Every structure is written in structure tokens, then in C-alpha cells.
RNA sequence: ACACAGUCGGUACGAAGUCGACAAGGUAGUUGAUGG
RNA sequence: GAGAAGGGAAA
RNA sequence: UGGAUGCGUUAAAAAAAAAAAAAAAAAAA
RNA sequence: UGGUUGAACAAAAA
RNA sequence: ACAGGAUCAAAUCUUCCUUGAGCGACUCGGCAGGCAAAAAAAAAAAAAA
RNA sequence: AUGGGUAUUAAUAGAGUUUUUAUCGGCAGUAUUUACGAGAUGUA
């Protein structure tokens, strides 16, 4: 959130710590479960609009 | 531009060739017109270029008008050159504020 | 609100040597006066004076911007500078060195 | 002539549900029935594109009513067909072959070539 | 008069309620695309200019304001000596925000720098 | 039913014995143009201004039309548009300058 | 995109696969989720003029009124007619409400128009048109026009486009008399236009002369009476006939000038439009008032 | 921070299917359908009723109540996030342009996202 | 609300003539 | 081509340079003529 | 100042 | 399950309206 | 001189 | 664009100034679509594989 | 806290995924189009 981003940017006690360059790891990501996406299907419908002309 | 003026000053310093009155007038006019853009180093370079050939057309007063603003970023060499030139070229008790700034 | 005559004035007779020279000489005078200008006011006045001369080019825009930076900047909201900014946005895709802009 | 006159004269005109063949309506109906009989006997006919498009519907009607197997549909098929060979072929081969096909028993293929003699599109 | 007025009066009657749905000339000095209230010395002058450009009467503008404003603002209007629109145009009284909003609704243009609300935040 | 509009002779004296038999105006007395009362006496007219541009060669004239006759102004404007006042006049080009005329509402 | 016979057969079999009819409510309530937050009532001045709206011609049917009089009526549907922008003097130099109607497939929509629709937060629209109006009658962006905009019994000024009849001669395009079918008439003269102008003195054929050409396809305006409205399906039943094909665009607006002075002077109208109050119940179907005198009196 | 940094508004000002900050919830009908189907899937999988809903081809999702509770908490948090972001964006659009999208008022083909045809 | 010809135009109109020159009818008798 | 379709005429390089150029300048290779 | 009765429009 | 036409039905209101085919500070493409 | 003014009038003037 | 600027500094939610009219307005910029096929009274109706 | 090692909420450089109808027959082959800059006075 904007509030949490501002909190981190204001904090003078929080850091990303690494004793050596190889310490830094990619941020951990939690992948949510899937469900049908008719909206995304609609977007794909638009994207494939002019394939006959190409 | 400023780079062209720097090149002109460097050329005037490298050799002792006597330039023409038209060159002196055009150079003085351009220096006065660009005075507000001069860094302390370029200002010292131009002041030395004029002083070596012993040409005075108000260029020293025109440069002193703006120099106090450019003093804050002056290196040791530029400070030496500016002190040496202006102390001799400015009229006695003319701009004590400038010397105080230096 | 506006001038009564807004239709393009398309001359139906070919110009003479002097007429065509006057028509085309902005391509020299614009860059010459941008170089000669030692102030943002002068730069913007010259650009406004040549506002109606077509067709401006990316190097014209870049020369204007470089001269503005060297003279020491200007208000980015002055309508004279807004002319330049809108022209830059118009010809953005035609710039080779967009990062320089 | 001039090609743009086609656009000019068709501005605001509807397509005819049935393409009209030459001659009077009885002659047109006889021609369509004869070509339907021949199509049944041959399984495929090389025609002009419009004629194939026109005869397709009657072929579909023939199959649809032959499948139903009632006296009324039998009489309809009889009114549509001419020859005993076509009758036998239809009932004993096409009907069992299409027993589980609800509809759409034929197809029209555009050859994408103009006939040499008269430049007639073919299918 | 009799059952009929003078023809001059009848023509003036017809012309009194002329209502044009266009601004069809850019040579006119009137409210148009790009109108700026600040071009005039004060809100009263801007309001008079806008109302005259619209072709509306002070009485009609005041009546609309009175009939469309809230109850407390109506009470304030009643309490105010004289006509509020006339005082505003003369630059004698300062309107409220609601009064100005109704005046702007009437005349079609803003009378002060219009403030739009954005949702931007610096991190 | 409809009838003729009210002209300028429906709002003043008529003297059939005079050359100017009645005073005629573009509008009625109440419809003649005027300056807004508080925004008056703030401006003055130089009546004519000329701008010379030697670089582009396109010069400008700006003229005040208040109180001038239509034809009397039109002849002068035609002279300026043609450029017959210039020593390098040529009939085969629009050899004149550009012209702006103000206060056309006040033409007589 | 099927064959002619396939389309004909599908037209024949269309009836067998219609959806079951919906259940029409008698009264409905509107909550805040269907009311634009900036939609507020206004009392008009003398110059106030409301906006029109867009509808699709659907068909025509015969309806009985209170006295038992039969009227042929045309049904139009306001198929998601939504305000998309406001024109203003300072921002556009004039005043109007921009309205979009219908639905267009995205695979047929263009990218910049798709961006416009995304900015408007609406599905892709089929058509867009303006309606010039007074400053006080401007509607807020996002509001959806309802048939309740029109009070039954009111007169409405309707504009549309007439159908195309193709190329027609003078006899069918302008009803020219032609010549006798007998009595020696020449074949070329049976349906000829006859003379087409005067003679050597004027030596021209006058402009706007009536001759053969492509008939139909003109902008036509008429008056209608708001006979009935149904808010559930946004249906408006207008007395009379309307130009255009079934499914063609129609503009509907308040009657004006003579018609307004003679018919609408006493019928109250909602300004700027129907402004629902949350929680209140309203009828779904509204009919025009009945005639005071018995039409079957003589 | 001492000098605040300004985020770019181009993600808000770019309207295309390639800009999610603007096309995430567009069109509203399909956004509602997506939310409804997500809720139905969650109720029919993370709250099993002892029968195969058959809404989708089967998945080997966790069945332990301890895991189901955490999955439900995650889904509730996702739902709250989506709802709050939609509400905030709608409020910003209303305050900026006065634009506002509401529920359909009538049963019409356009509201059904279908073309109006003679049939 | 919150070179005589050149100066006047700059002060009132608010733009610069540059190389352009302006005169008004008030000065005609100096050239006649 | 506005043209019985022709006739008489018909664009005047460079400074697009610049280390340029009598009396004043407030230094712009800018300026001198002009109170009712 | 006039069949200024080719067009514009002038004291 | 439909089409056309009038011998059928409706309107006769708007003209700064309905509508359109050339956004134009672009003065030598 | 007055919106006073469809085929109607008032004021002033010489 | 709340994008830039001023101030003994703003109700949440900008006190003002600038933005010649923030390109006529809103969008797009791998946008845009002439012909064929297949359809087709004006129009509308097929996402790609 | 004679005060900012100081307290709160970094999804943070990654908020990312193709719907519905549908027994069977049919179309989908091509062309045009965006740098009319002097990349460049190349990163100091």
C-alpha cells in the first residue's frame, strides 16, 4: 500500500542487509490460485482482431 | 558558445600573435553578453587572456559584476588568477565586496 | 476568438528568386539566431517569431533545447516554451536520439 | 460495358433468395429436378458456382425427406426425383449412410478457376 | 388596447424570446472556447459579460438562482437588501460558493478558477 | 400577417425638400453600438499603425474604421493591397502589404 | 455469412427457438447503485431545453386505449443509451450531451475508440451522437437515459433516416402521371416525364428538377405522441409511424415551437431528467391519459 | 524521504488492453462475472459439500482443514484487496472527471453485451 | 486581477518586435 | 488553361559572410524626422 | 455629382 | 413463416432544424 | 423627439 | 499532467500564478485497412487457431 | 528520550493466467502504412 511504502521510505532503522553481494535473493512471491477469466478472454478477443490482414 | 570562447582564450594564450581590432571588439562583446554564464575557471581564463595582451574595454568591470556569484565554485588556480588579475586591473577602492568574497 | 481568414493561403503563381529566398531563409536565420541568443528570453522570442515557418526538424528542436540548457533554463510553462514542448511531443517517434531530448 | 454500373444499379437492391435459371418456371423446376437426379447418381457434379449453390438446397431437401420414412415424405421425394436408379441409390445408400447425420449432407467447393470457353466460374 | 396589439409590438414579442442553439461566429466578442474569467477585473464584470453573451435578463437569472438554491441560501437572498444579481454585477456584494455555482450553471461558464480534484500523492 | 420592417424613416423627421431627406442608420437608435459604461474612456485610437518587417518582407497596416465611409476606406485598402504605393509594384503578383481594419461596426 | 437457402431456412425456423418471455414487474425500487451521485433536480427557466435520446426501432403493433380505440404504435428501445461527455462553452465552445448507444464487438472495434470506451468505463458502443441543450440541462457523465425521461401523453419530435428503394423512374419516385395506356401512345412515353423545362428563352433545366434517380435515404422528421412506456425493458411506444428500417437509429426529443405551444404547455416534465429518489417505488408501465370525450359519440 | 518522489500517472492515463492499471476491471459486466465465478469456485472447492460440483475439470487441491483455513484466509484477503482497489479507483475517477459507471437499468441486448439484430 | 514604439509595444502588448519597426499616424508630419 | 488554345512580356547570384563596420550609444554592427 | 444607365461605391 | 403496394395507417412540428464531403495561425507541398 | 407606429398619433419648427 | 512557480504557506479536497484555447474534444501510435473469398435493399452479423 | 538508533502497514524491481455456445455443410487469399534528422557537436 501507499501507506506502507511511505513507512518504509521514512524509516531510518530498516535496511536490506547483506554481508556479501551473493546474500541478496529475489523477493519471495506467493502465487494465488487460478479461476476462470472471461475478462482476459475478452482482451484476447480484441488482441487477435486483425490476424487475417497480417 | 562557452566552448568556443574557451577555445579562443586558449588560442590567445598559446601564442603571442597580435589579433585585429575587429576580433577584439567582437570577442569583448560576446564575453560581455555571455558573462552571466561564465564558470569561475572560464572567467579566469578570459581575464588572463585579456590581461596578457593588455586590452581594457570595461571587460574587467563587466566580469566583476558577476564574479561574486561564481566565486563559490572557484578552485585554487582560478582564485589565484582572479585575484592576480583583478587586484591590478580594477580601480583602487572600487569593489571591496568582490575582494571580500574572494 | 479568432482571425476571420483561417484557410491556407495557397499562392497560385510561382515565386521569384527574392520571394523564394525570403520564404526559405528561416532555415538559416533560425539556427543562426538561436546560436547568437545569450538568454532564454531571446531564444523563446526567436522561436515564436519563426513559429509559423514549416517544417521544423528534430535538429531544430534539439538545438533549441541545447541552447536553453546552456543559457540557463526557462520556465517550462511559458507558452513560448510550450510551443517547443508540444512540437517535440508531436515529432517524438521521428527522433533518432530520443534519449538526448 | 463499364464495371462501376454494377455498383450503380445494385445500390439499394436485395439478393434473390432463389437464383432464377433460364426459361419459364416449369422448365426451371424440371432442370433442377433433372440435375438433382444426376447428382444423386454421380455423387458429385462439376457445375457453375451459382448453379451448385442453387441445387444444394434441393439436394438437402431430398435427403431430409427421404430419411423420414413416411408416406407423405415418400411422395415428396417422388415429386422431387425422376429415375429408378436415383431412387434406388438414394434410399439404399444415402439414407443408411446419413442415418445418424441430422442435416447438411452436401458441400459446394469453389474451384477458383474460370471456364476456358466462356469464362464461367466453376465449382 | 383592443383584441390586437400593434404589429410592431407583435414582432418585438416574437423576437423577445429568440433562442439560438449556436455560437456561429468567431468574430464576435462573447463567451466561447477558451473563456477565462480572469480576463475581467472582477467576478461582477465576468458575470455581466457572460449573461449578456447568453442574452438573458437579470430578473430571469435571479429567479432561477432563487428557485434552485437551497433553503438557507434562499433565506439569505431574501434578507439581502436589493437584488443580489445586480449587486454582484455592480461589484457590491460577494456571492457564496453555492450562489456562484448556480450562476455558473445559468451562464454556461465559470466565474473563478475552477478547481478539479485529483488523487495524486507524492511518496 | 406580415408587413414591411420598420426602417430608419419610421423614427425621425422627413424633409422631402432637402437632399438628405431623412437620417438613416444601420440599426434603430436604441440598437446602435456603444461602449460598456464602466469600461469606457480607457482607450484611445492612433487611427493607423504600420509595421515594417525587412526580413520576411511581409508588412502590416492596422487602420481604425470608426467614422470612415465604406467606399472611401475601400479605395485606400485596395491601393494598399495591390501595392501601387510601392516603387516595385508589379501587376502580376499580390504585391501589397497585409491590412487589418477595426471598428467595422462604426462604418458609415 | 451462410448461403441464401441456409439463411432462408433459419428465418423460417426462427420462431421455434425464441427465449421464454420475461416476467414484468408492476413496481420497482431504485437504489444508490443505479443513480448517478451528481444527478440532481433543477427548476427550469424560460430558455431551458432538455436533451433528446437515442433508440432503436423494433417493430409496430396495434394497442387499445381506455375508450376502446385502436392505435397503431411503434416500439422503440433505449438500448443502454449512456452519457459519455459534456460539451461546454469554455471547453468546447458550445453546449451539448454526447450519448452512446448499442454494443459493438471488440474484434470490430478500433483501438483508439476502445481507449475512449475504457475511459468511459462502458462496453463498446455501436453509435454515438450529440444532443444540444441548455447549460442547466446538462447531464452527468455516466448517467443512463431511461424511458421515464418522457411523460406519456407528451408530443415528441422524432428524426430518422428513410429507407432506400433503389433506382426508380419519375412515375414511382415522384408519382408522375405519365400517359394513357392506349390511344396510340408510344412505348417510350407510357411512363415518361414529358417536358423537362422551358424553351430557347431561358435555355436551361432548372435546379432541383424532379427526375429519375436513387430513391429514399433522406433525413426525415415527424411528430409522435408518447403512448406508453415500460421502464423494465426501456421500451417506448409512440403513436404513429417512424422513418427507417427495423433496428435503425432514431432520435427522440421534446416537441418544439407550434407543437409544444399547442400540446405540451400544461404537461409537466422532469428537469433535467427523471431523478429517482432512493427507496421510492415507481410504476413499471405508464399509459397516456384517456380522451375526455367519448370517441364513439357519433 | 526528504525530497518526495512523484509516481507517474501514465499508467492511469493509458487506456488499452496492455495497460492493467486501467483495464483491470473493464468491462464491468465481465468483472462482475469474474468475481462471481471466483466466489463460486472457492465455495465449491475450499468448502466442499461432499459432491463434485463439476464446475471445472478436477484438481488435486488440499483437503486438510488446516490447509483449507489458510487458503480461505488468503482468498478473503485477495477479495478485500480487489474490492478496495476498485472502490478507490472509482472514487478517483468520480472526483477527477465526474465519470461514474452504474448497474444496468433495463434488460436490453447491450446490457447483455450482445448486438441488437432483427431476430 | 492580481525606441519608444518598441518599449510601448513590449509594455502593453507584451511581445518583442526584434528587428521589426513600428510607427503610428501621430508621427506623419515628421516625414511629410 | 478563365483563353479559335495564341500574342507581348516574364523571376536580377553572393552577406547563406563576420577574427564584422559623421555624430551618439548605455553596446543592440542599435540610433539621429515628428507637439496640438 | 454627370444615360454615373458596365461593376463598386465616393463629396 | 413472409414480401411489396395503396384502396390502408400516421405526421404535417423543427429551418441557428434535420444533415453533410474538405479541423483551417499551413503565407510559396 | 417618443417602439408612438399594418390605412393610427403626440412634441418642436419655421 | 495538479506538470512548473511565488508567499510569515492554502479545511479534509491547492491561497494564488503559469499552462496564448495544456494540440477543437477524447483516444491510438505493432495505430490505421484498399482488393479477393463469404455475405449483403441503408446497415448489421465470424477473435485467433 | 536535554530526542529521532524512535516505536506504524513495503505486493518491494514483478497484483501475473483464455469465457460462453456448439452433432452435421461453407469463406478467410493479398496489398498499403509510421525515422520527410544533420545518430553526431558520440557517453566529460
Locate cell 472526483: which residue?
Answer: H95
Using CA atoms of D39, D44, D50, D51 in order, give the dihedral in degrees to the nearest 10. Answer: -20
CA distance E5 to chain H (A): 50
The residue among B53, B54, B80, B86 whose CA lies nearest residue B67 is B86
Distance CA G75, CA G58 (A): 6
How far apart are alpha carbons D121 and D113 in whole angstroms?
Answer: 6
C-alpha closest to that of E83 among E100, E65, E97, E96 = E65
d(CA D15, CA G94): 45
F30: three-class secondary structure by DSSP: helix
> What is the Cα–Cα distance from H87 to F40, expressed in whole angstroms?
55
CA–CA dist G178, G161 (Å, integer): 29
Check if residue F15 sits with its Cβ under 7 angstroms from strand L: no
- The cell numbers describing B60, all together, are 574587467
3-class state of residue C39 by DSSP: coil
- Smallest CA-to-CA distance from F80 within F98, F58, F67 is with F98
Distance CA G76, CA G222 (A): 15
In angstroms, rounded to a whole number, what is the distance separating the alpha carbons of residues E15 and E3? 20
Cα-based angle E65, E67, E73 (whole degrees, multiple of 5): 65
Nearest chain H residue to E118 by CA distance is: H96
The answer to whether the CB of G118 falls within 8 A of the CB of G155 is no
Separation of alpha carbons G65 and G288, rounded Å: 9
**Residue G58 CB burial class (10 angstroms; 0-12, 13-18, ≥19):** buried
Closest CB to F47 among I20, I23, I25: I25
At residue B86, the 3 state secondary structure works out as: helix
Residues of I with Cβ-Cβ distance to E40 under 8 angstroms: 1
What's the rounded Cα separation, in Å, for the pair B58 and B63?
9
CA-nearest of G13, G74, G25, G61 to G282 is: G25
Which whole-number Å values give the CA distances from D23 to D27, D37, I11, in the listed order? 6, 20, 92
G107 CA to chain A: closest CA distance, Å? 5
Q: Residues with Cβ < 8 Å from G220, sequence gap 6 or more?
A: G159, G160, G161, G162, G243
Helix residue ranges, H only, C1-101: 17-24, 26-36, 40-49, 58-71, 79-90
Separation in Å, CA H34 to CA H25, H28, H37, H113: 9, 10, 5, 15
Distance of C1' in J18 from CA in F106, Å: 53
Task: Evaluate whether G29 touches G218 at the Cβ level (below 8 Å).
Answer: no
Residue G128: phi, psi to the nearest 5? -140, 140
CB G274 within 8 A of CB G40: no
* C-alpha grid cell, residue I5: 514604439
Chain centre to alpha carbon of residue H36: 9
Contacts of C2 in chain E (CB under 8 A): 26-27
Query: Which residues, including other chains, have CB under 8 Å from residue G198's CB and lie 6 or more apart?
Result: none
HEC letters along D33-48: HHHHHHHHHHCCCCCE
Q: How many CB atoms lie within 10 A of CB D40?
A: 25
For G117, counting Cβ atoms within 10 Å of its Cβ (0-12 exposed, 13-18 middle, 19+ buried), the class is buried
CB contact under 8 A, B37 and C35: no
Determined by which method? cryo-EM
Helix (H, G, I), strand (E, B) or coil at F62: strand
- Joined grid coordinates for residue C88: 517535440
Backbone torsions φ then ψ of G156, nearest 5 degrees: -125, 140
The C-alpha atoms of residue B19 and residue B10 are separated, in whole angstroms, by 14
Which residues are within 8 A (CB) of G81 and not within 5 positions of it... i.e. 6 or more apart?
A: G53, G54, G55, G99, G100, G101, G144, G145
Q: For strand G27-29 and strand G53-64, is the pairing parallel, antiparallel, or unpaired?
A: unpaired
User: Which residue lies nearest N25, CA-to-C1' measured?
Assistant: G92
Q: For chain B, what's the residue count?
A: 102
**Which chain G residues touch H108 with a CB distance below 8 Å?**
77-80, 233-234
* Cα within 13 Å of Cα(C22), Cβ side: 11
CA C59 to chain centroid, in Å, comes to 11
Spatial CA neighbour of H111 closest among G129, G33, G82, G23 = G82
* C-alpha closest to that of I21 among F97, F63, F49, F88: F49
Is G56 in CB contact (< 8 Å) with chain H?
yes
Given in angstroms, what resolution was this structure solved at? 2.2
Backbone torsions φ then ψ of G84, nearest 5 degrees: -110, -20
Taking alpha carbons only, the member of F35, F31, F101, F52 closest to residue F72 is F101
Helix axes D49-68, D25-42, angle to 10 degrees: 70
CA E37/CA E40 separation, integer angstroms: 6
Q: Which nucleotide is nearest to F97 (CA to C1')?
A: L27
Instruction: Determine the Cα–Cα distance for residues E112 and I1; give it in Å rounded to an integer.
Output: 11
Looking at the DSSP assignment, which residues form a beta bridge with residue A5? none
**Closest residue, by C-alpha, to the C1' of N29:** C93
Strand partners, F62: F49, F100
Q: Is the CB of F21 under 7 A from strand K?
A: no
The dihedral sign for the CA sequence B50, B54, B60, B61? negative
Q: Cell 426501432 identifies what position? A: G57
Widest distance between CA atoms in chain H: 65
G7 and G267 in contact (C-beta within 8 Å)? no
Q: Cβ of residue I31 near strand N, that is under 7 Å?
A: no
Residue G239, strand partner residues = G73, G225
| G53 beta partners | G252
The residues of H whose Cβ lies within 8 A of any Cβ of G are 15-17, 22-23, 26-29, 93-94, 97-111, 113-119
What lies within 8 Å, CB to CB, of E95 at 6+ separation is: E43, E84, E88, E103
For residues B75 and B41, the answer to whether their CB atoms sit within 8 Å is: yes
In G39-194, beta strands by DSSP E = 53-64, 70-77, 82-87, 96-101, 127-132, 155-161, 164-168
Cα–Cα distance, H48 to G68 (Å, whole number): 60
Give dist(CA E54, CA E30) in Å, integer.
9
Q: What span, in angstroms and rounded, lies between the C-alpha atoms of G235 and G58? A: 9
**CB count, 10 Å around CB of C58?**
18
Q: Which nucleotides of K are covered by protein (CB under 7 A)?
A: 8-11
- According to DSSP, the β-strands at G281-283 and G27-29 are antiparallel
User: E30 to chain I, minimum CA–CA distance in Å?
Assistant: 19
**What does the CA dihedral G186, G188, G189, G191 come to, rounded to 10 degrees?**
130
Q: Does C1 touch chain E (CB under 8 A)?
A: yes
CA distance F51 to chain C (A): 14
Residue of A nearest to G108 (CA): A49
d(CA F51, CA F59): 6
Residue E47's nearest CA partner among E78, E90, E18, E17 is E90
d(CA G175, CA E54): 47
B21: β partners: none
The 3-class SS string of H9-63 reads CHHHHCCCCCCHHHHCCCCHHHHHHHHHHHHHHHHHHCCCCCCCCCCCCCCCCCC
Could you tell me which of G50, G116, G39 has the C-alpha nearest to residue G84? G116
- Cis peptide leading into G100, omega within 30 of 0? no
Half-sphere exposure of G125 (CA within 13 A, CB side): 26
**Cβ atoms < 10 Å from Cβ of B86:** 22
Distance CA G161, CA H76 (A): 54
In H, minimum Cα distance to G19 occurs at: H119
H-run or E-run covering G117: helix G111-120
G37 touches strand L (CB under 7 A): no
C-alpha cell at position D38? 444426376
Report d(CA I20, CA F97) in Å as an integer.
14
Among E41, E39, E56, residue whose Cα is nearest residue E108: E56
Torsion H84-H89-H92-H98 (CA) sign: negative
Q: How far apart are CA G1 and CA F93, in angstroms?
A: 61
Angle at C83 between CA C82 and CA C85, to 5 degrees: 60
CA distance B9 to A45: 68
Q: Number of helices (H) and strands (E) in chain E: give both, helices first.
A: 6, 0
Measuring CA to CA, which residue among F71, F51, F70 is closest to residue F61?
F51
**Measured in angstroms, what separates residue G184's CA from nucleotide N35's C1'?**
52
E98-101, long-range: CB < 8 A, 24+ apart: E98/E69, E98/E70, E98/E73, E99/E65, E99/E69, E99/E73, E100/E43
Residue C14, SS3 per DSSP: coil
Angle at E42 between CA E41 and CA E43, to 5 degrees: 150
Amino acid at each position: 500500500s501507499v501507506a506502507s511504502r511511505i513507512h518504509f521510505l521514512n524509516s531510518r532503522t530498516r535496511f536490506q542487509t547483506a554481508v556479501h553481494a551473493s546474500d541478496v535473493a529475489p523477493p519471495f512471491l506467493l502465487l494465488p490460485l487460478a479461476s476462470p477469466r472471461p475478462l482476459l478472454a475478452y482482451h484476447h478477443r480484441f488482441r487477435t482482431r486483425n490476424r487475417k490482414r497480417g | 558558445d562557452l566552448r568556443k570562447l574557451e577555445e579562443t582564450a586558449q588560442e590567445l594564450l598559446r601564442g603571442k600573435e597580435t589579433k585585429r581590432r575587429a576580433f577584439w571588439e567582437i570577442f569583448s562583446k560576446r564575453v560581455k553578453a555571455s558573462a552571466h554564464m561564465l564558470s569561475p575557471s572560464l572567467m579566469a581564463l578570459i581575464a588572463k587572456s585579456f590581461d596578457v595582451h593588455d586590452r581594457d574595454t570595461g571587460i574587467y568591470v563587466a566580469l566583476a559584476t558577476v564574479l561574486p556569484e561564481a566565486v563559490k565554485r572557484a578552485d585554487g588556480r582560478s582564485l589565484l588568477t582572479l585575484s592576480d588579475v583583478f587586484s591590478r586591473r580594477l580601480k583602487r577602492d572600487s569593489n571591496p565586496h568582490l575582494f571580500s568574497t574572494l | 476568438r479568432g482571425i476571420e481568414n483561417t484557410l491556407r493561403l495557397r499562392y497560385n503563381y510561382t515565386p521569384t528568386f527574392t520571394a523564394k529566398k525570403r520564404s526559405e531563409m528561416w532555415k538559416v536565420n533560425l539556427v543562426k539566431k538561436i546560436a547568437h541568443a545569450t538568454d532564454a528570453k531571446q531564444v523563446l522570442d526567436v522561436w515564436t517569431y519563426y513559429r509559423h515557418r514549416r517544417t521544423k526538424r528534430p535538429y531544430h528542436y534539439l538545438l533549441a533545447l541545447q541552447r536553453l540548457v546552456e543559457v540557463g533554463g526557462c520556465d517550462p510553462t511559458d507558452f513560448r516554451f510550450r510551443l517547443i514542448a508540444r512540437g517535440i511531443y508531436r515529432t517524438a517517434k521521428r527522433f533518432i536520439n530520443l534519449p538526448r531530448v | 460495358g463499364w464495371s462501376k454500373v454494377v455498383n450503380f444499379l445494385n445500390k439499394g437492391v436485395q439478393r434473390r433468395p432463389h437464383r432464377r435459371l433460364p426459361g419459364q418456371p416449369h422448365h426451371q423446376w424440371n432442370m433442377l429436378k433433372t440435375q438433382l437426379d444426376q447428382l444423386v447418381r454421380s455423387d458429385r457434379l462439376e457445375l457453375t458456382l451459382p448453379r451448385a449453390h442453387e441445387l444444394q438446397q434441393y439436394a438437402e431437401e431430398l435427403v431430409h425427406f427421404a430419411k423420414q420414412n413416411t408416406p407423405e415424405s415418400s411422395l415428396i421425394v417422388e415429386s422431387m426425383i425422376f429415375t429408378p436408379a436415383a431412387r434406388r441409390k438414394l434410399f439404399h445408400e444415402l439414407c443408411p449412410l446419413y442415418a445418424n447425420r441430422p442435416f447438411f449432407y452436401t458441400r459446394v467447393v469453389n474451384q477458383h478457376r474460370l471456364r476456358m470457353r466462356d469464362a464461367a466460374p466453376m465449382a | 388596447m383592443g383584441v390586437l396589439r400593434s404589429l410592431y409590438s407583435r414582432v418585438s414579442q416574437r423576437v423577445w424570446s429568440t433562442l439560438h442553439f449556436r455560437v456561429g461566429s468567431r468574430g464576435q466578442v462573447r463567451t466561447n472556447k477558451g473563456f477565462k474569467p480572469t480576463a475581467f477585473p472582477h467576478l461582477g464584470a465576468a458575470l455581466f459579460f457572460a449573461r449578456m453573451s447568453k442574452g438573458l435578463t437579470r430578473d430571469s437569472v435571479e429567479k432561477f438562482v432563487r428557485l434552485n438554491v437551497s433553503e438557507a441560501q434562499r433565506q439569505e437572498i431574501k434578507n439581502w437588501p436589493g437584488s443580489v444579481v445586480r449587486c454582484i454585477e455592480n461589484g457590491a456584494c460577494i456571492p457564496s460558493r453555492e450562489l456562484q455555482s448556480r450562476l455558473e450553471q445559468v451562464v454556461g461558464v465559470p466565474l473563478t478558477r475552477r478547481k478539479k480534484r485529483a488523487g495524486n500523492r507524492r511518496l | 400577417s406580415q408587413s414591411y420592417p420598420k426602417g430608419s424613416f419610421h423614427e425621425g423627421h422627413i424633409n422631402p425638400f432637402a437632399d438628405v431627406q431623412w437620417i438613416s442608420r444601420p440599426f434603430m437608435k436604441r440598437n446602435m453600438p456603444r461602449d460598456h459604461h464602466p469600461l469606457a474612456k480607457q482607450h484611445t485610437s492612433l487611427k493607423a499603425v504600420t509595421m515594417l518587417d525587412e526580413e520576411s518582407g511581409n508588412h502590416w497596416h492596422v487602420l481604425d474604421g470608426k467614422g470612415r465611409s465604406v467606399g472611401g476606406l475601400a479605395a485606400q485598402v485596395v491601393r494598399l493591397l495591390q501595392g501601387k504605393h510601392r516603387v516595385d509594384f508589379t501587376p502580376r503578383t499580390a504585391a501589397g502589404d497585409s491590412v487589418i481594419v477595426v471598428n467595422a461596426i462604426h462604418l458609415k | 455469412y451462410d448461403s441464401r437457402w441456409v439463411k432462408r431456412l433459419d428465418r423460417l425456423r426462427e420462431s421455434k427457438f425464441y427465449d421464454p418471455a420475461p416476467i414484468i414487474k408492476e413496481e420497482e425500487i431504485l437504489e444508490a447503485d443505479k443513480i448517478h451521485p451528481l444527478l440532481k433536480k433543477v427548476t427550469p427557466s424560460w430558455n431551458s431545453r432538455r436533451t433528446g435520446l437515442l433508440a432503436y426501432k423494433i417493430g409496430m403493433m396495434s394497442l387499445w386505449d381506455g375508450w376502446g380505440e385502436r392505435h397503431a404504435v411503434t416500439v422503440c428501445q433505449v438500448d443502454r443509451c449512456v452519457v459519455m461527455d459534456q460539451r461546454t462553452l469554455d471547453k468546447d465552445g458550445y453546449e451539448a450531451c454526447v450519448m452512446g448507444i448499442g454494443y459493438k464487438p471488440i474484434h470490430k472495434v478500433t483501438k483508439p475508440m476502445l481507449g475512449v470506451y475504457i475511459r468511459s468505463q462502458i462496453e463498446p458502443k455501436s453509435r454515438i451522437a450529440e444532443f444540444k441543450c441548455s447549460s442547466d440541462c446538462l447531464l452527468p457523465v455516466g448517467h443512463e437515459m431511461s424511458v421515464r425521461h418522457f411523460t406519456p401523453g407528451q408530443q415528441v419530435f422524432v428524426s430518422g433516416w428513410s429507407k432506400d428503394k433503389g433506382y426508380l423512374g419519375v412515375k414511382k419516385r415522384w408519382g408522375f402521371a405519365g400517359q394513357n395506356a392506349s390511344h396510340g401512345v408510344e412505348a417510350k412515353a407510357h411512363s415518361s416525364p414529358g417536358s423537362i423545362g422551358q424553351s430557347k428563352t431561358v435555355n436551361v433545366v432548372w435546379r432541383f428538377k424532379k427526375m429519375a434517380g436513387h430513391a429514399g435515404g433522406d433525413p426525415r422528421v415527424v411528430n409522435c405522441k408518447v403512448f406508453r412506456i415500460e421502464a423494465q425493458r426501456n421500451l417506448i411506444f409512440l403513436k404513429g409511424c417512424v422513418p427507417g428500417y427495423k433496428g435503425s437509429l432514431i432520435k427522440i426529443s421534446d416537441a418544439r415551437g407550434k407543437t409544444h405551444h399547442r400540446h405540451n404547455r400544461h404537461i409537466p416534465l422532469h428537469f433535467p431528467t427523471f431523478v429517482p429518489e432512493p427507496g421510492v417505488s415507481y410504476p413499471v408501465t405508464l399509459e397516456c391519459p384517456d380522451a375526455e370525450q367519448d370517441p364513439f359519440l357519433y | 524521504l526528504r525530497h518526495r518522489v512523484l509516481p507517474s500517472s501514465l499508467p492511469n492515463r493509458l487506456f488499452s488492453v496492455d495497460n492493467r492499471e486501467t483495464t483491470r476491471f473493464w468491462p464491468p459486466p465481465l468483472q462482475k462475472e469474474e468475481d462471481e465465478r471466483r466466489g463460486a469456485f472457492v465455495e465449491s472447492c475450499l468448502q466442499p459439500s461432499g459432491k463434485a460440483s463439476l464446475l471445472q475439470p478436477p484438481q488435486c487441491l488440499p483437503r486438510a482443514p488446516s490447509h483449507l483455513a489458510k487458503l480461505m484466509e488468503e482468498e478473503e484477503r485477495l477479495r478485500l484487496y480487489r474490492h478496495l482497489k476498485k472502490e478507490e479507483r472509482d472514487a478517483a475517477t468520480l472526483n477527477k472527471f465526474g465519470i461514474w459507471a452504474g448497474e444496468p437499468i433495463a434488460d436490453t441486448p447491450a446490457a447483455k453485451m450482445q448486438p441488437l439484430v432483427a431476430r | 486581477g492580481p525606441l519608444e514604439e518598441k518599449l510601448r509595444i513590449a509594455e502593453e502588448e507584451g511581445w518583442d518586435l526584434l528587428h521589426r519597426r513600428v510607427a503610428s499616424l501621430r508621427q506623419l508630419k515628421g516625414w511629410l
